[PDB]
Amino acid sequence: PRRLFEGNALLRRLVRIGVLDEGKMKLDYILGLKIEDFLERRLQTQVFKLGLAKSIHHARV
Amino acid sequence: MQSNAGEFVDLYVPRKCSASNRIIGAKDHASIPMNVAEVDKVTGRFNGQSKTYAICGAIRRMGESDDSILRLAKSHGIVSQN
Amino acid sequence: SGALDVLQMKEEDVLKFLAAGTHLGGTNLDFQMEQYIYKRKSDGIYIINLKRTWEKLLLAARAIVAIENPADVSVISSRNTGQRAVLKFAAATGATPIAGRFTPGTFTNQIQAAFREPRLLVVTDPRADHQPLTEASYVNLPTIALCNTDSPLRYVDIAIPCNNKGAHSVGLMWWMLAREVLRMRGTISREHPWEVMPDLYFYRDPEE
Amino acid sequence: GKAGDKEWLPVTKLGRLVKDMKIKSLEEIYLFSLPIKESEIIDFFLGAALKDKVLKIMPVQKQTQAGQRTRFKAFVAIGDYNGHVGLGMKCSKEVATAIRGAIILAKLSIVPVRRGYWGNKIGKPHTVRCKVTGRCGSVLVRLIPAPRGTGIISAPVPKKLLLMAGIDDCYTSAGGCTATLGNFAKATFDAISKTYSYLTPDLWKETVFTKSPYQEFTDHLVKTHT
RNA sequence: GGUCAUAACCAUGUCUGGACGUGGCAAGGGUGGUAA
Question: Does the CB of D2 have a partner CB in chain B at under 8 Å?
Answer without folding.
Answer: no
